[PDB]
Amino acid sequence: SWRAQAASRLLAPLKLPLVLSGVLAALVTLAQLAPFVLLVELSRLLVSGAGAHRLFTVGFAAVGLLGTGALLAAALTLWLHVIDARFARALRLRLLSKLSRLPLGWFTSRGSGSIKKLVTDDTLALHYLVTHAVPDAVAAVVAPVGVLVYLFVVDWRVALVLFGPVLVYLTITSSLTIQSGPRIVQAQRWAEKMNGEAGSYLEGQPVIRVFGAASSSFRRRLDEYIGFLVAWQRPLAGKKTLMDLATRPATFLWLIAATGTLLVATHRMDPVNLLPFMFLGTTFGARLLGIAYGLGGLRTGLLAARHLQVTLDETELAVREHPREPLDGEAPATVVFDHVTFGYRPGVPVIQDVSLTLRPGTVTALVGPSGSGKSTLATLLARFHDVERGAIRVGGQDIRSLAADELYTRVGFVLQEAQLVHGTAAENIALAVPDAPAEQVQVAAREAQIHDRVLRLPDGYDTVLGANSGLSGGERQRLTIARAILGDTPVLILDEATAFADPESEYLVQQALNRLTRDRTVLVIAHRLHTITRADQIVVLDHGRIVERGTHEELLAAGGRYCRLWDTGQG
Amino acid sequence: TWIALVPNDHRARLIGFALLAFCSVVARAVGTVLLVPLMAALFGEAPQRAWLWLGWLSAATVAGWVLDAVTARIGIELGFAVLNHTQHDVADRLPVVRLDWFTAENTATARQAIAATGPELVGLVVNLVTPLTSAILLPAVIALALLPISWQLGVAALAGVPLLLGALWASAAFARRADTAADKANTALTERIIEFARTQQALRAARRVEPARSLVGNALASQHTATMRLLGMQIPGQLLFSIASQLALIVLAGTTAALTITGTLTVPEAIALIVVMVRYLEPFTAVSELAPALESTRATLGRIGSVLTAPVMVAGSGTWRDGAVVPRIEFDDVAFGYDGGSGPVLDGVSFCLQPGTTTAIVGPSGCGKSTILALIAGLHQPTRGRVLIDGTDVATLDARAQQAVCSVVFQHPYLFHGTIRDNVFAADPGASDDQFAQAVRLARVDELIARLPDGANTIVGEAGSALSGGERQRVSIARALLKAAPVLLVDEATSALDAENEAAVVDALAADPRSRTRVIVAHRLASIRHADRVLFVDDGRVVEDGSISELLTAGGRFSQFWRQQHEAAEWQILAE
């Protein structure tokens, strides 16, 4: 509401230049509206003897005023557009440098539209707020105060008389804003649900063309929508009409005419002192209403800044904590673990106290009923998030005491995303080691079964991997797997849900995985029992609380949840 | 070509409202012109004469009051009518729009067309039409009525007004151009950052985030563009109309003072003429104020017009009675490529499916297999071929009798917000409980309809109870199995997790006691096991034909695919 809620916190530097531009805008507005005072003076000059040169001096003053007003406005807009760019540049730089510290889970949380929305929309809205919304607001604020003071200093009768229509407008507005009490939020809810239904209707177009009886839902929703708006706006008609009528420059003219006629005809005041009201003071009504719009113009920029600062105040990864001597009993492999209880969004804990151990060179299967916090346990190992209690240690060194290079030189993950970078295909096959002597690339691609599909390309190894490259899923999943075979990281996280995408081109992906997992510690996130039923050991779990671990037959004949899971009638 | 053709004809409130608006403008005009003689009594030797003209001005302003009230009421009524008409039009027009017009952002535009025009179209006539047009014409009629009393003054304003109009127009255009230049530059700048954020997971894992960051950082910091010509093209957008008005003020005041100094008119009313010029210069300021609302209305109306101007499909004069029994199909080199460049293309597919069999379309990835189903149904148009189901041509047939032959199962399921009973009944508004019962039993969904809390009435819509994959797919299978249309073309939903879904597909395909022509783009060998004639398709053109067993003797490109599917179903993940 007040001085500091993250918004002035973001806008720390823009105070001194902002008040400078504000006082300059007030000055240039007074320079805009002084010509009417000059006109009043010339009018007085006309009724006592004109002469040759006095009016010419007046006109010279007027043209000088015009020139200096234009010069001042130009100076102001130039200074604003100057002061904006430096702040925009610093903001973008700080935003990037913060973007390259966030935990990986944040990106998967946000998505794809969120990032673009945030960056582009908020930077552009902030620029607009700085360059347009502030000067227009301060001008629309200062102008009525000035004209009111000038109208009071020339006469206190007519201004007090003129105040009436303002009272009328205010009371009518306040009486109006009692009938649309809940109607406003109800209409907002209608709007958002209609947006949802519109999105649904559009995304499901083809079905509509075949079964033409599925548009009745959207049709009746649209009918009810328009009926709601119609029934809403019908009452407020006369009230809005009166609200408008008692502002217009017509009624002001008659009011001023009547008051001035009553004053002058009885010799209560000279007639030349009525010129200010015939001049500016008849548009005063419609001028006052502009204040509301000028102030409301700030809302968008304020919300933008709030959102952006809330984002930028995100917490980064943990500190590279106290380095302690490793190897109590462990090896390069053997990724122990201990009472993790990750949780995330506190209230609800998604995992619970687990304590397992991958052998030096054996496989491990994370079977479990889908949705019961099964993949998150694996992603947490690649420092997608930080544990709140307990310690993982690849070997002996807890992942906290490991730089972002010593970590991703011992842990290589393969997940449900592609993540291709914009470059030549040879670079995407050699992102791990940036300089492969153009034959290791070829052997690591002929071991991932992607040699033919990259040879028969438009330009082969050098076609830029654009968004319209002409590729698919398993055709580039093999590209990323070829990239991963060069890394040679002796710990692998293998999301098994990638072997059955585009079920046409999956034999090659299976061969790639076969010759990718050769004597290195794996951890498979299982989705089918028959493919994993022979790895080394099977771990069952339902939202934490590892139910049972051990080998296949052990899990099979114990009466276990494994036995109640592998009996879907053998399917 | 209709940009914003809202009203049907109605002619009546239209002409009446136009005439009323013109008379309401004349009201303020005569108000000011009748103010003209008033001041001549104040700054004079007789200050008592003013009362008569005060009364006349009171009559003028009460007339103005009545007129504005009635025009505002008619305006809100016309706003209601235009809202109704335009939204009904857009809704009823969306379905016939060409199918391939929906891109990833064109869809967003269309979504905005019918989600953000409620409050910005009802309050349109009473906020943009009447004020702007009432303020444009007013200066002209003021000058006109000023002519017969002071022709030296009248002609000055009558010649000045087009200059001020042009100044307003040019200022608005300059502001718009500056804004477009600015936002385009900003987007071109931030594109690099938008890109660097999406590959944030492949970079860190490839232990190369620091150089990849430093590069874009250096580039962005270095580039400046100096913004200077941008400021120079921005400034006139701000300061042009203020200068025009400020100059017109001096011009008019000077001509009035000059006419006073010679002795044509007299002092007591030259002041009245000055006041009248000041009154005449205000509508220009009002129009200058009504810039941003105008721009936003232009934006929204542009959305709506863009939607209302999309290309359409064409169908004419179809002849159907049943299909007679069950249609046979035919192709001729259909060649559908969406531009000739990037796309399915289908350079030379030509076959013939006899009247009623099962037929699978196997083949390597590359969705010619789905555009074939699209062409068969009706959704797309072959750019140079002729699908001739049974003996006619589908392209030269009527729209009403076009979506009345095929019944499609879709690879990506879709259920609209409502009870699942309504979703399944979204194919036949009749369909007594015998049809619905046999349909709900054929597709294995009676299980879902029996283990439901309230039963057959759950509101699935978005974020269903569980309804993940298999369930929605079985609902879609049942719905497409309801329709009587005598050709069923199935699309194998990508879900190799549900043995129930597999058996549902096999049952719907081979156990229906009806008789229809079946086509199933399948990859699960369990499905293509029953298809008695398969079509292999690579790079458009059909590469192989014949029964299953026969192709396993030829030994070409199908024996390999069969032996590759018999192996990628038991791939164990042992490590040795």
Author numbering:
A (entry chain A): 276 to 846
B (entry chain B): 4 to 579
Text of the article:
The heterodimeric complex IrtAB has been identified as being responsible for the import of the two iron-loaded siderophores (Fe3+-MBT and Fe3+-cMBT) from the periplasmic space into the cytoplasm of Mtb and other mycobacteria. Like other ABC transporters, IrtAB contains two transmembrane domains (TMDs) and two nucleotide-binding domains (NBDs), with a single TMD and a single NBD in each of IrtA and IrtB.
The cryo-EM structure of full-length IrtAB without a bound nucleotide resembles the canonical fold of type IV ABC exporters, but its TM region has a partially collapsed inward-facing configuration. The two polypeptide chains of IrtAB are asymmetric (RMSD of 4.37 Å after superimposition of 336 Cα atoms) in this state, with the largest difference located in the TMDs of IrtA and IrtB with an RMSD of 7.15 Å for 139 aligned Cα atoms, especially in the TMHs 4–6. Furthermore, in the cryo-EM map, a strong continuous non-protein density was found at the interface of IrtA and IrtB at the periplasmic side. In the absence of ATP, IrtAB adopts an open-inward conformation, in which, due to TMH6 of IrtB protruding into the central cavity in the TM region, IrtAB represents a low-affinity binding pocket to guarantee unidirectional transport.
